[PDB]
């Protein structure tokens, strides 16, 4: 079916007919590189490096020509070249490489003769320094992003409705597949249904907050163990008189979990959704925590998504 | 007209007669570079590099002189120089460059003869290492800033007043021109009018909070689609008995949207304003979202700022 | 005994039977390196470097062979090698090293003859650049983590119950063993007891918030001096009719302190716990702050954990 | 007088008799370097670099000896050294330098003869790479800290009491000496008085929150202009029946301003204090904002701290 958020939590919209997109991306380069695909990113990385090399190699070759350093121009024995041992565009590129990387073997070096050569080298160096810096920074950040981290936190596949403490509650389960901690986490659902007009031309989406509680309905400092989040279905509930039955109803229960990560201080956001068909009536998550002889608690994720009837 | 915040959200104040500004900027160098103009920043970048080069080149030339390494001083065949192949200030600069960048060709190298040369090189290296680090860090950060990001979020051009759910509401529209998400966003307006005294000498600006609501008047986790923010004009409203009519009134409705960015964990703040003349009476934003055959929602920004009369 | 959080605040759970763990770690490499053990991390660091070296050395040796550059292949005096001075896998590795580190002595350099050599070098450079960057970034971050910082903040060893301002209060003490400040700190306890079912197969842990107050029960901006945190044991208390006596009761009072660090803007979280046996009845922390002639306050941590009876 | 926080906002406590301080600092190296003095930090920076150089130079000299590479050991014309052109501890150090920095001139290079030399070089490289990284990271961060930034935000020198809107209010003034913005700022005062016991042995400090309001008593998104913060002295006030008169009373009004910075996403905290003597009765900050012909507001900091009587 059509849905707001993919079951794993990826965006499910496209945008169209943005005027002046290109210029706007050119202004905000940094973000544009951080958000770009990986293929084109690798390509741009390698191209930056080797293409700066190549361009400056052609440039150095031209400087050589204009000064006649080439061999079969028949330079006199008097002739000090603008650069040493450069008489082919190949060696030109090779010197571009040796100097810009700063490998600097020493079989080709600059000579005191040509000043334009000197300034040209300084320019090459400064610019390529800049570009190296920029690209490496974007690459660092694009790895560092915590989206990918989100995958090691998992919602239940199914939401289930039953009597908890005598109150009708819709229940979901969350867990963390790593030892590193999430902190300051908070669960907040939104409820999103369908409003059709005159036409299939437009839709107004009416959001409704749904809050989810654990103990005091506040937040949970640490997501130590698979946490059971439940929401009160009483007349305060925007869900109350939904068609509570099997399958029918035109809605989506978007679920959001936002909280800080321990080792990076980044805010990390997991998302997923529940369809009217995905919700189950009168069911009980098999408790997924058991204790062991060595003395502390075990989270066995074979039962995480298991349910049985009440 | 005079305004608090430029329509795009840039500061519109100047400060004057700050005593001891210069020293204060010299203390806080880091921020001072991060906040400085780009031109002077590039200039300072290149100058740092090449001027360290130049200074140490002069220094090396002097060391050469004091040791008589120059050629037409007629050094005996006995003579080991403080440095090899340095007999001109040109080569001096060239060695400064080759060592400080660590290009190190090898046609000019240090010799074991002069110890002062050695310490001098170590100093050059350590200091220039420091400066390189500092400047590159400031450059990284100054790119990374999220102000520029703010431009890819856009407020409506016009605020419009009408009956929403039967309540008189002032309405604005927001949207995001990129696929990357904003999170934890919150809209808060302030109301700023004009208080004149005895003189044109001074003014007290009285702020008044105005809150803006969407569904529950709480916040919206994600800015997926162009969001309609509305404020209740009832007697709780600081706007209530403003001259609600066309144009007149001496005020500014400053609008602020603050929230975390997904890919960087940075807090991002958009701002703009509304003048008494910019506000429109009895108008309806054409709904800007439509659905498509492939199945999910389209945000067509040609209608974003479009209105028609109710 | 079995406990939730180790007395110092380390996690005390294991997870089991995670399906598809390996692929999931391969997706999220960055975090996986940041969270990995130090031994394997050093190993992987050094291996990256020297093994890239070694692989490309073998590669260069092969290029040499295919071009017959080896000596006892008896290369004619006509013969320009793909690389200079490479006729042994040893020198191959040595050139890999000299170029990839960019040490570039110059006794072995590339020649204009073989283009495949050139592209091969460019590839070596680009890839090894990438890997260097990644590993150094993960290493930086893994140092930077503030967990280790947490150890310089210390809870009391014992929680003690007595009449503070006439109200029965459970009391703990916190302190900071460094001059650097913590800011925005907030103390929040959870109460965790034991719910057994039919079987030793599963357990539901019921959390209950416990709030801890100092002056106004709000938060404390700065943790200047050893702070006494106390909780009101009245009928609002989830502790109220616990077996308040010596030792008995099946619970754990988990204590959490979350707040921003000054010099890094990182959020820092200390944790520890209290067992039913660790709690003491009718006791008074000896006040740990005294003033001195030079004029300001001294925090003497010999008394920090000292108590005497009321 | 004795005070909690220095008028500018520096900590005014010392800690004493911390057991196991040294080991604890050795665990948390990163923070320990970030928090250490600048002198010792520069010293440690330069020492790391040049001392790694020096140690490995001695090491290389020893390898030379053990292989007899020294000249006046009279090496036969047959003799391939472990290293080229190294026959003095001086050149040893020079090669340490040329390789570890990767300056690599080429007058001294390694030869294929000695494998131990090779591994030794690889080790030198890897370790020194590590250390370089660590130190540069700590240096970056230690600059980046926003404490120093705090100095460009200034509280009033004097707190003043008077009738604002008819309510008795204690009033202070804040301002920002830079164009860069602070965001999400919040002012919160604490009130700290003196509780003496039996002895001059100990003191319990009782904190009391004091909230400070501007318009709605909420927070102020941006600190555009010098902001007047006022607190309501009515019977809700912990200040209410203080000795409201000149000078007397044994207290300190600690003032805290916490908020995010624009260009770095760092949280920035300004602090200062007010003594019972520093507070003034019946006084009015001269309004410090005036408008100008060019059209927008001017903050003239000559009047910032000026007052006159009501
Ligand atoms: C290093 C590295 O990451 O290279 C990635 C590589 C090439 O990039 P690739 O063409 O696949 O582009 C990625 C692809 O679009 C993913 O689907 C995106 O994540 P998502 O689905 O939208 O969520 C991802 O964006 P983000 O996740 O980075 O933001 C894109 O980068 O992917 C393959 O292995 C293709 C094998 C065929
Ligand atoms: C790289 C790079 O960014 O170079 C910028 C370059 C020179 O710098 P430039 O003189 O223009 O200085 C920039 C200019 O003042 C902008 O207006 C500022 O933004 P805003 O208006 O106040 O909002 C900006 O500050 P910030 O945005 O960085 O903070 C300033 O840096 O600008 C041109 O292309 C001039 C073409 C003629
Ligand atoms: C540099 C550097 O840090 O090397 C560490 C080194 C080898 O690593 P090592 O085998 O000990 O692995 C560490 C060990 O597991 C610790 O116990 C972990 O902390 P914790 O106990 O779970 O809390 C730590 O994880 P984290 O703290 O980094 O996250 C692990 O890295 O440790 C020794 O000195 C072994 C001496 C025998
Ligand atoms: C570069 C660089 O910063 O060098 C600093 C340099 C040497 O360091 P220095 O001995 O002064 O040590 C600094 C001094 O203790 C300051 O007072 C400290 O700040 P504060 O007072 O406690 O607040 C500062 O700590 P932090 O501010 O960095 O945290 C310390 O680093 O200081 C001089 O110019 C001495 C001139 C005689």
Swiss-Prot record, chains A, B, C, D:
Transmembrane residue ranges: 36-62, 115-140
Biological processes per GO annotation: adult walking behavior; cellular response to potassium ion; central nervous system myelination; establishment of localization in cell; glutamate reuptake; L-glutamate import; membrane hyperpolarization; non-motile cilium assembly
Reaction(s) catalysed by this chain's protein: K(+)(in) = K(+)(out)
First-listed, main subcellular location of the protein, grouped into a coarse class: membrane
Topology in the lipid bilayer: Multi-pass membrane protein
Location in or out of the cell: Membrane; Basolateral cell membrane
Site, Role in the control of polyamine-mediated channel gating and in the blocking by intracellular magnesium: residue positions: 132
Function summary: May be responsible for potassium buffering action of glial cells in the brain. Inward rectifier potassium channels are characterized by a greater tendency to allow potassium to flow into the cell rather than out of it. Their voltage dependence is regulated by the concentration of extracellular potassium; as external potassium is raised, the voltage range of the channel opening shifts to more positive voltages. The inward rectification is mainly due to the blockage of outward current by internal magnesium. Can be blocked by extracellular barium and cesium.
Name under which the protein is recorded: ATP-sensitive inward rectifier potassium channel 10
Source species taxonomy: Eukaryota, Metazoa, Chordata, Craniata, Vertebrata
